[PDB]
């Protein structure tokens, strides 16, 4: 019925790059300013395509990442607070989780983008933070539950015993899963290799640096302030040396 006209637009470089997606708003603005002051002013301007789809997906991706992150970090804080009746341990663990996530993704960005030249797919970040949060919860909770049940004999001896007991198990589990995930590097699909090796390098870094040195050393610096609302002793009342045998 002649009420709508359509134009078919082609891009120069890659439509689905960061620039081909920033061009969508510019196309809409150009078409809107073209009918300004003409009898067609006020017409509805619809822009469909495939770079428009990815503009909208890229916009929604940020907010969905934020929703998932807020939700997961609050759940993690809540379980670390319920288990260890302490706000400082929960906050320290949430902070080390955020720091280890950042460092993991930065390491994978380095390896993939700056060294191998291949940029990271846009879903790698999401699928990586999902799994990495999921397993960091496991390992941090197992470590700090043991720490809490053993600091009865002194915070330092409690940390020594908790390491010797649960740090080995945490690293075994972490390394098994990390090397399972780094076997995706054999896929022809580069997105599978990217997500697999991102999860794998993240877990390697976590279990070998963060959860193995940065979390218990923070528990050792903050001696009794690691359990703050609970009043714990740095070490028990000194015992007298035992009688022989």
């Amino acid at each position: 019925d002649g009420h709508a006209v359509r134009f078919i637009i082609s891009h120069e470089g890659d439509p689905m790059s960061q620039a081909g997606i920033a061009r969508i708003a510019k196309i809409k603005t150009a078409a809107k300013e073209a009918i300004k002051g003409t009898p067609l002013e006020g017409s509805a301007i619809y822009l469909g395509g495939t770079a428009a789809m990815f503009k909208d997906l890229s916009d929604g991706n940020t907010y969905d990442l934020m929703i998932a992150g807020i939700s997961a970090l609050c759940l993690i804080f809540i379980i670390m607070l319920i288990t260890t009746r302490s706000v400082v341990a929960a906050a320290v663990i949430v902070g080390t989780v955020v720091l280890s996530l950042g460092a993991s993704f930065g390491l994978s960005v380095l390896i993939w983008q700056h060294i191998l030249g291949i940029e990271l797919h846009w879903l790698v970040l999401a699928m990586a933070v999902i799994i990495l949060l999921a397993v960091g919860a496991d390992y941090n909770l197992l470590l700090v539950a043991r720490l809490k049940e053993e600091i009865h004999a002194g915070i330092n001896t409690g940390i020594i015993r908790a390491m010797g007991g649960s740090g080995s198990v945490v690293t075994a589990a972490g390394l098994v899963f990390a090397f399972t995930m780094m076997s995706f590097a054999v896929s022809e699909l580069t997105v599978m290799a990217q997500v697999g090796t991102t999860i794998g390098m993240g877990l390697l870094f976590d279990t070998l640096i963060v959860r193995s040195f940065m979390t218990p050393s923070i528990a050792a610096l903050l001696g009794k302030w690691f359990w703050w609302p609970q009043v714990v002793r740095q070490r028990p009342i000194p015992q007298p040396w035992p009688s022989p045998a």
């Binding site: 990815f54 699928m127 699909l189």
Partner: protein, 304 residues
């Protein structure tokens, strides 16, 4: 006829491809079926053909890593049965709830649920067996060691699994269907993995432990090495924290250079048919001719 992302779209792409390659062109002419709908078809059809090689390589790696952790074939076998039974129960339960239209599935929620189920199952099995063997190496008999394992790790497994379930159910509140469809199947998968890990795990440990020396520890000097690491941590915590934070800074300083990409034909083999159609078109027009925009201006009066 489909809708990009669904299965009717792939039906349509293969139908069109059938129609097109059904008849022969003149000599010299070659026809293709390109576009972000045939590319998605070839992508989703090569995803499974790579996934079935991954399902073998990851298990071939899991087995050798279990042999390296537990220097024993019987223990690796037992704990692998734990993991495999958990994964089977999870896949079965979610395929059941999706088959009877009780919950909403996806061909992406499944590929993530299998990964997460394997992660959780191996973690919980290693936790349980590690605590049992640690209590066993301190001199406790099989009964006391079983009870120490439970009293130490059951609440941890329960809490951590229930938070994974809650966190992955909180995905249901996102907007993209990619993430939004991960909510209920992943939460249900985690609940099933946790129920399995807490009932079937300890059951297998309590049955197999009463025979010979099945689950008895072998490598306990690892506990000594980790006690020495803990001693170094409690004696000099400041320096070690500084070192760990310095290492984490290397990764944290690369993040403000992160650029992403939405071209799926960069992360796919160039051997796919749709990508070779893309190449044939790029030989002649340009890279962006097969991905056109459409702008419509709808006015209220006849514009002819």
């Amino acid at each position: 006829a489909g809708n990009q992302g669904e299965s009717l779209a792939n039906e349509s792409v293969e139908a069109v491809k059938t129609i097109v390659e059904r008849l022969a062109p003149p000599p010299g002419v070659k026809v293709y079926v390109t576009g972000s709908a045939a590319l998605v078809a070839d992508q989703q059809q090569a995803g499974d053909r790579s996934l079935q090689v991954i399902e073998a390589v990851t298990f071939t790696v899991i087995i050798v890593m279990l042999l390296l952790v537990y220097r024993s074939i019987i223990t690796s076998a037992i704990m692998l049965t734990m993991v495999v039974l958990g994964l089977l129960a999870t896949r079965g339960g979610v395929a059941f709830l999706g088959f009877h239209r009780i919950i909403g599935l996806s061909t992406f929620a499944t590929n993530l649920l299998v990964v997460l189920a394997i992660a959780a199952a191996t973690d919980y099995a290693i936790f349980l067996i590690g605590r049992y063997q640690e209590a066993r190496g301190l001199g406790q008999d099989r009964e006391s060691a079983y009870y120490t394992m439970f009293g130490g790790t059951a609440h941890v497994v329960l809490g951590s699994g229930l938070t994974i379930a809650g966190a992955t159910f909180c995905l249901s509140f996102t907007r993209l269907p990619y993430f939004q469809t991960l909510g209920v199947p992943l939460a249900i998968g985690m609940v099933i993995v946790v129920a399995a890990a807490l009932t079937l795990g300890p059951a297998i440990i309590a049955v197999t432990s009463r025979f010979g020396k099945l689950l008895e520890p072998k490598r306990m000097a690892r506990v000594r090495g980790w006690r020495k690491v803990g001693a170094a941590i409690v004696r000099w915590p400041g320096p070690i924290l500084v070192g760990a934070v310095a290492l984490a800074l290397v990764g944290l300083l690369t993040l403000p250079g992160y650029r992403t990409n939405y071209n799926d034909r960069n992360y796919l083999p160039a051997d796919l048919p749709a990508n070779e159609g893309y190449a044939a078109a790029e030989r002649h027009f340009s890279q962006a001719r097969m991905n056109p925009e459409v702008l419509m201006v709808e006015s209220d009066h006849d514009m002819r």
